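To the team - protoporphyrin IX containing FE complex, inputs and output below.
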Amino acid sequence: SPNLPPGFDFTDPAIYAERLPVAEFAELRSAAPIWWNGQDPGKGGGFHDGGFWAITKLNDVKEISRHSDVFSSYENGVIPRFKNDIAREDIEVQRFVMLNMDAPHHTRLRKIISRGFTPRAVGRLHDELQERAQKIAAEAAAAGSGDFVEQVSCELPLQAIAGLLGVPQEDRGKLFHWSNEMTGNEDPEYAHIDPKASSAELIGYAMKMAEEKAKNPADDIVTQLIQADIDGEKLSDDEFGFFVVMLAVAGNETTRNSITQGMMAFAEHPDQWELYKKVRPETAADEIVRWATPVTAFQRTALRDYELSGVQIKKGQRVVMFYRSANFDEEVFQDPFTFNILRNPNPHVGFGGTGAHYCIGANLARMTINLIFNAVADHMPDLKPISAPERLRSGWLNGIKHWQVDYTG
Ligand code: HEM
Ligand SMILES: NC(=O)c1cc2cc(-c3ccncc3)ccc2n1CCN1CCNCC1
Ligand SMILES: [Cl-]
Ligand SMILES: [Cl-]
Ligand SMILES: [Cl-]
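Output:
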């Protein structure tokens, strides 16, 4: 038995509203790397199966991720915590995004979606996102101080999605609003926000975009997705709507929280910040993602009995891959608790473990991170925090809602 308080639940949103449970994860890696996380009736975050297996070692996370034939994303979705009284149908509706599908449905969709994340398509966004990163930093600097999350972290990830999809500038304001309103629904600051209605408006806008491109096909990603190839595979209008919802959801808070927590790490380690401003190493992005681990945990469901590192996982049981624990696995990383922007190799699982569902936007995220921190170094090299950050109440997402900083220093 690990040295934990009785009834500790690693998906408890009340934990992450206050802290990352780093020491509790380290105790599991030390005394029980695969530990049954029991859950009382009605306190399962929408799941009523009694609990889950906490997966805390990077090797075990990687094994689950590559064995998608056994560990299903579709059965219960990949998000391990919602509001306790969520209806089952609201969990299953997530199966319309490819993140919560299994093969062969997932395989078909990913093949089509791959057209949109080719090195070409992502690389073609570099110039506009650099210009936007410089403009964001310059505006924050001119403001002198403010909420780093809103003034520096929030916009560039949304502009990457907008620039990727070819969204007209006049529409990006409401698009960003809908994308942000699907967020942090478990936090009291956003308790009055309806993520269902926001998704419907995203789907409506996306489907109209697909209808415009059906009559006006140009050379852009959206056309390539809604244009049938030789084998006739393509995104239907509604599937494109679900793809945009996925991007607006997947490519938003995660990159944002990487930027905020990366700057928090720089503030806590000024020697690393001084090093970054001089050298600007591209390895910084991956260490920032390891340190930030924006997705604390995703889950899978065992479709058959499976033995994982001497532990018998039974059919139907959930496994929760705690990336936050794996990214600080003492047996994998040299000095895991050291923030080292020059860390290489850096085999973190912040983008998930290698497998069918590995983050398709990983290189877009790295580019966004590298560009915004170059802009921060260019325009506010002496920025200093004003007060402590406010964390997001979530059982699986690692979010910073607000962080007051002084750009002038
Ligand atoms: C630092 C930023 C990001 C982090 C930490 C992150 C993390 C993740 C994780 C953990 C997964 C699941 C891996 C698995 O289940 O094995 C994933 C998948 C995915 N990500 Fe990201 N992500 C980030 C940025 C982005 C961006 C910028 C985009 C798109 C613009 C994106 C789009 C997706 C999609 C579509 C999937 C589903 C892939 C599939 O199911 O086949 N992500 N991401
Ligand atoms: N801020 C949220 O809550 C939320 C954030 C988020 C991020 C991803 C993701 C990130 C990176 N790579 C792949 C996926 C997936 C789901 C995410 N979500 C769930 C929100 N979603 C709202 C409506 N109800 C169901 C849950
Ligand atoms: Cl194996
Ligand atoms: Cl928001
Ligand atoms: Cl990996």
